[PDB]
Amino acid sequence: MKGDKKVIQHLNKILGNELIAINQYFLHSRMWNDWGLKRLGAHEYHESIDEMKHADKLIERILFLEGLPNLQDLGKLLIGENTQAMLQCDLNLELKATKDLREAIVHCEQVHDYVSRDLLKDILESEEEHIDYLETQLGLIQKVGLENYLQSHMHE
Amino acid sequence: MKGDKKVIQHLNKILGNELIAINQYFLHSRMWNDWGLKRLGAHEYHESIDEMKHADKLIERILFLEGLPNLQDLGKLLIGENTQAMLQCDLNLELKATKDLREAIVHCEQVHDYVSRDLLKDILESEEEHIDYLETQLGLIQKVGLENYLQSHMHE
Amino acid sequence: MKGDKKVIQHLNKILGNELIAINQYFLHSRMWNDWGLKRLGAHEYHESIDEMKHADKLIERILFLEGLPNLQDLGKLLIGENTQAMLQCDLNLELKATKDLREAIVHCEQVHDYVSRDLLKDILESEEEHIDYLETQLGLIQKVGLENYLQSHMHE
Amino acid sequence: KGDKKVIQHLNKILGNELIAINQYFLHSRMWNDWGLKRLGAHEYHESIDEMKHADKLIERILFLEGLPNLQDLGKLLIGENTQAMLQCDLNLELKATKDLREAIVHCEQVHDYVSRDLLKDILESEEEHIDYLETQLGLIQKVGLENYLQSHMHE
Amino acid sequence: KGDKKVIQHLNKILGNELIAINQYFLHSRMWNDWGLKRLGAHEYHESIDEMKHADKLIERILFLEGLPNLQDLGKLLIGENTQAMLQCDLNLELKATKDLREAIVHCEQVHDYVSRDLLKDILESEEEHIDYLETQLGLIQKVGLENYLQSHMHE
Amino acid sequence: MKGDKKVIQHLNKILGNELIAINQYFLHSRMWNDWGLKRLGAHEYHESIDEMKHADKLIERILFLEGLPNLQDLGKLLIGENTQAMLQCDLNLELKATKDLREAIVHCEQVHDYVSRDLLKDILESEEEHIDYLETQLGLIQKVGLENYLQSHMHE
Amino acid sequence: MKGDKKVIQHLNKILGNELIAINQYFLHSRMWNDWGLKRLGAHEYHESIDEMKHADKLIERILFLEGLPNLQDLGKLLIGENTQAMLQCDLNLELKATKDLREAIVHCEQVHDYVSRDLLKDILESEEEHIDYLETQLGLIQKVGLENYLQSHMHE
Ligand code: HEM
Ligand code: HEM
Ligand code: HEM
Ligand SMILES: [K+]
Ligand SMILES: [K+]
């Protein structure tokens, strides 16, 4: 069902962010595991799985609108050096993702592509919930201190 | 356990191939669904999952060898435009991969990283079964015809 | 709840389109069943049932907004003479349905009937998925050939 | 001891079955290599069924103070494509039923009735396989090869 | 397409397995004929084991675009009696392991690591059988033939 | 089966590193239990059992190759005075056991004792996993603080 | 509880006899397995496990009493060359063990260490059961012949 060219472009833009998130979160998940912070590893792994399912729905929407999914042009992964930096990279990644999501919703509404708008809103509702985790985690590090925070995520 | 720099370099290259395969296999899977060849979409999606598991093991082995897993440098996806071509692309990708894996295995045996070798051997055994599948499909196209082949793949 | 007069007009129009698809899809299903293409007959029956369910929701919203649902006036059924013509008649009916669904959604927005917007967005999601199904059958008729496509739809 | 030429027959059949085992097993795996899994599955079972037949003959040969020969392996008729493989099977299957018919006759002359009834039940299995094989070749004509192969991709 | 001499080893290993399938199946049925059912049953499962090794080798050959050789049946080592039987199986198993070892080195050379792994797992399985055979022979020396045969009358 | 002489000399050397490990890990386990660190005790106990299980497999092999298992010689147990030292002591013992394990594999390969090489790769695999556990624990003391790290291993 | 310097000396002595039995009985078990005497190999395996459990209770007692367990100094494993000698090597080893257990029990009583006496007495009961096994087995070899006796221990 021929889609607007600019809708497919926003869609591929969102898709590209999800592909960054997939590789960033999956590497953070495995770094934390290597370090023995198994609870953070498991939680970051599910974030990456979530971004994958988001990617999948975007790929499907694009193909339906007779666009071409772009899985070739991987942007800049924000790999952090240690736990607090890893969280603060996920968060800045997520703040870029939510901005692009809103701009895409704005266009989808202009061109009346209301079903793609709903797909992006659902993805955005989930990214905001990730921001919440992130914000909450960074504030717990300040309240309980890094040594306690890290101890709490040793075990699952 | 500080491992050979060149072993890490090799593992990071195999990982690089798994990352290509993941995105290529996953796109072909969703293209095949878009076209209603739901049985190819199902097989290809499971070829994609399987390469994601391979990446997971390599990212873990690297991290144990105190290497830095490279998930940033994505190679050329080979995306076909029709079923015979999409299968052929995957078989091309798989052939550069089993080669890179034999090269990687040789070096592991020299520096005596026998555990890294065993993992690469296990991956290579996977990729050789994918090659079996792919060769077999393209042969089925000759033997039964492109139309029957596609027909045999509409329904799961 | 006294609801906007133009909102009710739009909803009745959408209901009118559902009432065509119900009858067009049902006759196509039975036509296909009489020709021995039971798999297409079962699919088209379920498309019909789905339009009935959409009709129910519109009928109920219209009554809540104190309008009068119009089940009296029945548009032109687009009946095909053969399988490929019937698929194309469904597709044409659906493209016009999503035209009107978008126009109706634009209005609900402007007059703040956000809940009526949401029902229509859900219907639109269903209808856009039917368009995907129809375009895919038509594409499969090309890839695998009419005779194979019909053979594939003999048994359930 | 038991009659001598009987043990010579049982050992001719046993040699047939040993040809069949290897031929059907190799065919079966060729079909799987090619992705024709339903033919593979069915040929594998013809292999298994011939192994069972060989088993029962070996047991009877020994009971007759005979010596089972498993060293003298005939010529296998290995086909290069599906229609050839079926015809090779059918050729082998027809020599094997002729040989079986000769053995059975010698059994009835020397009054070895239990060796006969064993050979009959084998010959019943081999006539079943001949029906299967004739049917398959007939279907290739009725539906065309490309279709006949499509119907044996999946199990 | 697989390396020329790899496929020749694989057919070599395959040929030894085909000798083992038959040798073990016949010993098995002689031990049963004699009433040594525990040895019969053990020797049957060694036969079945080699059939699985045969199968995995035919599938690998075909994958490599080679031609599996099931025609050329080598020399079967039969025994007149329990002690020769076990020693024949042991001699075959000793030719078998030498060849496997040779084949593995070629695979390692050309870099066919997957065919190596497969032969390694056959070897592992053949060393196991060698352990069983030496252990059995050991036990005839430790407990005496008449007893070791008593211990393998029943299952 | 008659086996090479310097192969058996190696297995008995690996075996000797296992016999040392059995005793060292069991004592570290029982010490941690007595200090109330029941989680370290439990884990070190299963490390001991694993070494017991490797030893049984090495003995099984030597007797098959008609060597003579050497359970009589027993090198120096490295018994730590504190948790960190006990971890380090295990870690030193493991790195030597892998140094020697590799040397055993090299020779096994060169004389075509391919089954014995497989056993040592497996042992080697299991030892590298213990290194990861050890490296990780020592790292975790840096990250969460020694007080938190011992606290975290009070309870099971 | 600060224990008596000589009680600890006695516990480490018994612990030494148990560390010998472990290794002697284990290797004896595997020897009997290699020769196909599975019943002997199994029963001997359990004797070995039994001693491992005795040794565990000792180390725990030593540590509770604030001594140092001695797992470093291993004595003379008595390895027979055949079934009949293996059984006698075992019998000779238990007889040295039950001497040392009685002297140790005398001393625990002299210093009012009733709990250590009970542990040791429990070990002593067990070793006396092993003696009755061994006495009965050697006597069985007499009444049936080494040939029948070994026949009777081929199968578990
Ligand atoms: C470095 C890249 C990736 C890695 C390491 C990775 C890893 C994984 C793993 C380990 C699993 C679960 C394994 C299992 O099912 O047993 C998984 C599931 C999945 N992956 Fe990936 N993945 C990657 C990239 C992607 C991409 C690019 C996509 C699609 C855009 C994707 C889509 C999915 C989906 C849809 C699932 C199933 C999720 C579910 O429903 O549970 N993955 N991935
Ligand atoms: C003299 C030749 C042979 C004899 C007497 C023989 C006998 C048997 C028997 C009685 C069975 C049990 C089947 C059942 O009752 O379900 C069997 C199974 C089997 N045979 Fe054979 N066989 C022979 C040769 C072969 C060969 C040459 C191959 C392969 C190259 C082979 C492959 C197999 C396989 C894969 C099985 C199934 C094993 C399992 O997974 O259970 N056999 N054989
Ligand atoms: C050459 C020395 C040893 C060998 C070959 C050996 C072997 C074994 C094996 C195979 C098991 C079975 C584990 C399982 O399957 O879960 C076991 C259990 C055990 N071992 Fe050892 N072991 C040795 C030394 C020791 C020592 C020195 C100790 C004590 C300091 C010990 C304490 C134990 C304990 C407590 C168990 C658990 C037994 C049970 O409760 O069932 N082992 N051993
Ligand atoms: K704390
Ligand atoms: K007896």
For residue E29, what is the enclosing H or E element? helix E4-34
CA distances, G20 to each of F73, F74, G14, G67 (Å): 12, 12, 10, 20
E126: Cβ–Cβ under 8 A, 6 or more apart, which residues? Answer: E93, E96, E97, E100
User: Inter-chain contact B30–A59, Cβ cutoff 8 Å?
Assistant: yes
Is E62 close to D25, i.e. CB distance below 8 A?
A: no
How far is residue B80's CA from residue B87's CA, in Å, rounded to a whole number? 8
What Å distances lie between residue C22 and C45, C84, C103, D20, CA to CA?
A: 9, 19, 21, 60
Domain boundaries, chain A: 1-156
Whole-number Cα distances in Å, C143 to B40, B147, C37, G154:
14, 7, 19, 68
H helix runs in chain C, sequence order? 5-34, 38-64, 83-110, 114-144, 146-151
Here the tokens at position C29 are: 């299903």
**What are the C-alpha distances in Å from B43 to residues B50, B153, B155?**
11, 10, 12
Which CATH superfamily includes the segment(s) E1-155? Ferritin, core subunit, four-helix bundle (1.20.1260.10)
Contacts of B21 (CB under 8 A, 6+ apart): B47, B48, B51, B90, B93, B94, B97
Chain E nearest CA to D135, separation (Å) = 27
Contact A36 F140 (CB under 8 A): yes
Residue B76 CA, ligand 1 centroid: distance in Å:
20
Closest-CA distance, D29 to chain B, in angstroms, reads 13
By the 8 A CB rule, do E77 and E22 touch?
A: no
CA distance A145 to F95: 35
Residue E12, Cβ neighbours under 10 Å: how many? 18
Q: What's the burial of F90, exposed, middle or buried (CB within 10 Å: 0-12/13-18/19+)?
A: buried
Between the CA of D55 and the centroid of ligand 2 the distance, in Å, is 10
Tokens of B22: 């993941």
Q: How many helices (H) and strands (E) does chain D have?
A: 5, 0
Is residue B31 classed exposed, middle or buried when 0-12, 13-18 and 19+ CB atoms within 10 A define those classes? Answer: buried
Answer whether B97's CB lies under 8 Å from B41's CB. no
Nearest residue by C-alpha to atom 30 in ligand 1? A55
As a whole number of angstroms, the distance between CA C13 and CA C32 comes to: 28
Nearest alpha-carbon partner for E90 in E47, E132, E146, E48: E132
Please name which of A2, A3, A16 lies closest in space to residue A117, comparing C-alpha atoms.
A3
What is d(CA B77, CA B72) in angstroms, rounded to the nearest whole number? 14
- Residue in this structure with the two tokens 């030892």, named with its chain if needed: F127
The closest of A83, B67, A90 to F142, measured between CA atoms, is: A83
Which among E111, E114, E117 has CB closest to B106?
E111
Give the residue among D85, D36, D26 at the shortest CA–CA distance from E11.
D26
**Which ligand has its closest atom nearest to the C-alpha of A152?**
4
**Per DSSP, which regions of D30-151 are E strands?**
none
Max CA pair span of chain D: 55
* DSSP 8-state code for residue D70: -
- Amino acid type, C69: P
**What is chain C's length?**
156
Q: Which residues of C are less than 8 Å from A1 in CB distance?
A: 95, 98, 128, 131-132, 135
Tell me how far apart the alpha carbons of residues D128 and D58 are, in angstroms, rounded to a whole number.
22
CA F61 to chain centre: 18
Q: What is the DSSP letter of C77?
A: -
Which tokens sit at D65? Answer: 């103070």
d(CA F102, CA F113): 14
Q: What is the DSSP secondary structure assignment for residue C66, as one 8-state letter?
A: T
CA–CA separation, B54 vs B52, rounded Å? 5
Interface with E, mutate which of G144, G150, G153 (most E CBs under 10 A):
G150
Count how many Cα atoms sit within 13 Å of the Cα of residue G13 in the half-sphere of its side chain.
Answer: 18
Q: What does the block give as tokens for D151? A: 């119907």
CB D56 within 8 A of CB D110: no
- Closest chain E residue by Cα to residue D74: E71
Return the amino acid letter for A126: S
Atom 22 (ligand 2): residue with closest C-alpha? D51
Cα A42 from chain centre? 16
Return d(Cα B149, Cα B142) in angstroms, integer: 9
A121 and A105 in contact (C-beta within 8 Å)? Answer: yes
Burial of G67-93, coded b for 16+ CB within 10 Å and e otherwise, reads bebbbbebeebbbbeebeebbebbbeb
Contacts of F52 (CB under 8 A, 6+ apart): F22
Tokens representing F51 are 């070494």
Give the ligand whose atoms come closest to the C-alpha of residue D25.
Answer: 2
Return the HEC string of chain G. Answer: CCCCHHHHHHHHHHHHHHHHHHHHHHHHHHHHHHCCCHHHHHHHHHHHHHHHHHHHHHHHHHHHCCCCCCCCCCCCCCCCCCHHHHHHHHHHHHHHHHHHHHHHHHHHHHCCCHHHHHHHHHHHHHHHHHHHHHHHHHHHHHHHHHHHHHHCCCCC
* Distance between CA atoms of residues F51 and F63, nearest Å: 18
* Residue A118 to residues A69, A115, C107, Cα–Cα distance (Å): 19, 5, 18
C107 is annotated as contributing to ligand binding: no
Nearest 5°: the CA angle B95, B89, E66 is 45
CB count within 10 Å of CB A143 equals: 8
Neighbours of ion ligand 4 (CB under 5 A): A 148; F 148
What's the distance, CA G116 to chain centroid? 18
As a whole number of angstroms, the distance between CA F48 and CA F28 comes to 9
Torsion of CA F55, F57, F60, F64, to 10 degrees: -120
Give the residue numbers in D contacting E (CB under 8 Å), as ranges: 18, 22-23, 25-26, 29-30, 32-33, 55, 58-59, 62-63, 68, 70-71, 73, 75-76
List the single residue in C with minimal CA-CA distance to B84: C143
Our answer on whether the CB atom of D30 is closer than 6 Å to any ligand 2 atom is no
**CA distances (Å), origin B19, targets A18, B13, B15, B51, C75:** 15, 10, 6, 8, 53
Q: Using CA atoms, how far apart are residues F127 and F133, in angstroms rounded to an integer?
A: 10
Q: Roughly what angle, to the nearest 10 degrees, separates helices G114-151 and G83-110? A: 170
Encoded amino acid at A5, one letter: K
> How many whole angstroms from A144 Cα to the centroid of ligand 4?
9
Indicate the resolution in Å.
Answer: 2.5
CB of A38 within 8 A of CB of A68? Answer: no
- What whole-number distance in Å separates Cα of residue B60 and Cα of residue A32? 11
**Chain D: touching chains (3 or more CB pairs < 8 Å):** B, E
The dihedral built from the CA positions of residue B112, B118, B121 and B123, taken in this order, carries a sign that is negative
CB B83 within 8 A of CB B40: yes
What φ, ψ does residue B4 adopt, rounded to 5°? -40, 130
Two structure tokens written together for G32: 């009997």
Between C83-110 and C114-144, two packed helices, what is the crossing angle to 10 degrees? 160
Ligand 2 pocket test target in D14, D30, D51, D70 with most atoms within 8 Å of CB: D51
**Residue A156 is labelled as binding a ligand:** no
Chain position carrying tokens 């086996």: F3
Which residue blocks in chain D are alpha helix, DSSP H? 4-33, 37-63, 82-109, 113-143, 145-150
**DSSP calls for E83-121:** HHHHHHHHHHHHHHHHHHHHHHHHHHHHT-HHHHHHHHH
* CA–CA distance, A44 with A50 (Å, rounded to integer): 10
Name the phi and psi angles at A98, rounded to 5. -70, -35
Q: Pick from E62, E71, E75: which is nearest to D30 by CB? A: E62
Q: Using DSSP, state whether A82 is helix, strand or coil.
A: coil
* Opening angle at CA F68, ends F67 and F72, nearest 5: 150
Which chain G residue shows the shortest CA-CA distance from F53? Answer: G26
Tokens of A122: 């659902």
- Between CA D24 and CA D33, with CA D27 as vertex, the angle to 5 degrees is 145
User: Which residues of chain B lie closer than 8 angstroms to E111, CB-CB?
Assistant: 102, 105-106
Judge contact between A17 and A73, C-beta under 8 A.
no
User: Which is nearest to A131 in space by CA: A76, A82, A93, A80?
Assistant: A93
How far is it, in rounded angstroms, from Cα E68 to Cα F147? 66
Check E113 against B128: CB less than 8 A apart.
no
Q: Give how far C139 is from chain B: nearest CA, Å.
A: 7
Asked if residue E54 has its Cβ within 6 Å of ligand 2, the reply is: yes
User: Of F132, F136, F144, which has the smallest distance from its Cβ to A147's Cβ?
Assistant: F144
Contact: A154, F140; criterion CB under 8 Å: yes
Q: What single string gives the DSSP state of each residue in chain B?
A: ----HHHHHHHHHHHHHHHHHHHHHHHHHHHHHHTT-HHHHHHHHHHHHHHHHHHHHHHHHHHHTT-----S--------SSHHHHHHHHHHHHHHHHHHHHHHHHHHHHTT-HHHHHHHHHHHHHHHHHHHHHHHHHHHHHHH-HHHHHHTTS--
To the question of whether residue C129 is assigned a binding role by annotation, the answer is: no
Tokens at E48, concatenated: 């079945």
Of B137, B139, B148, the CB nearest to D146: B148
Instruction: Report how far ligand 1's centroid is from the alpha carbon of B30 (Å).
Output: 14
Which atom of ligand 3 is nearest the CA belonging to F59? Answer: 5
Token pair listed for E143:
């407990």
Q: Which of G74, G73, G68, G69 has its CA nearest to residue G23?
A: G74
Asked if residues G15 and F41 have their Cβ atoms less than 8 Å apart, the reply is: no
Of A1, A64, A114, Cβ closest to residue C105: A114
Closest CA to A129 of A43, A66, A58, A57: A43
Where residue B11 falls (left for φ over 0; alpha for ψ -120 to 50; beta otherwise) is alpha
Assign a CATH topology to domain B1-156: Ferritin (1.20.1260)
CA dihedral of residues D139, D143, D145, D146 (deg, nearest 10): -140
Of F140, F40, F126, F127, the closest CA to residue F80 belongs to F40
Q: Give me the residue label for tokens 């560390």.
A: G19
How many angstroms away from the CA of F105 is the closest CA of chain B? 9
User: In 10 A of CB A102, how many CB atoms?
Assistant: 12
* C-beta of residue C22 within 8 angstroms of C-beta of residue C45: no
**Does A115 contact C124 at a Cβ distance shorter than 8 Å?**
yes
Is residue D44 within 6 Å of ligand 2 at its C-beta? no
Q: Whose CA is nearest to atom 40 of ligand 3?
A: G53
d(CA A103, CA A116): 13
Burial of F76 (C-beta count, 10 Å sphere; 0-12/13-18/19+): exposed
Answer for the pair F38, F155: CB distance below 8 angstroms, yes or no. yes
Measure the CA–CA gap between G57 and G72, rounded to whole angstroms. 17
* Tokens describing residue F104: 């055993």
Which uninterrupted H or E stretch holds F34?
Answer: helix F5-34
Contact A76 B72 (CB under 8 A): yes
